[PDB]
Amino acid sequence: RSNNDVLATSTMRVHAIKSELFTQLEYILTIGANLRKSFGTAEKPKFPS
Amino acid sequence: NDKVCELSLVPDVVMTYTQGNVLNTLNNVNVIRQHYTQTEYEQNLEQI
Structure with a gap:
């Protein structure tokens, strides 16, 4: 399988293609604030780390 | 001499023996061109 003992060849071509397709996506929203607690309001604004 | 000449010959083996379908029935030949x-x-x- 490794030696140079083989007949001259010149004729490779793409014979076949397989593909693992990413076909459905997922999203990671990464912000720097704890969404899972209280925001305050427009003028009483809470900024939760 | 003045009266009799000599001819050296070698046979056209190709012409002689190959006419018709002969060549195309040989098998297991390594062809080259x-x-x-x-x-x-x-x-x-x-x-x-």
């Missing part, structure tokens, strides 16, 4: 029938050409087309 030839021309191809349409069909056999399409097959070797990539190579050429």
Whole structure:
């Protein structure tokens, strides 16, 4: 399988293609604030780390 | 001499023995160059 003992060849071509397709996506929203607690309001604004 | 000449000969083995379909029935021959029938050409087309 490794030696140079083989007949001259010149004729490779793409014979076949397989593909693992990413076909459905997922999203990671990464912000720097704890969404899972209280925001305050427009003028009483809470900024939760 | 003035009256009689000599001819050296070697036989055209090709001409003599190869006419007709002979060559095309030989089998298991390692061929080295030839021309191809349409069909056999399409097959070797990539190579050429």
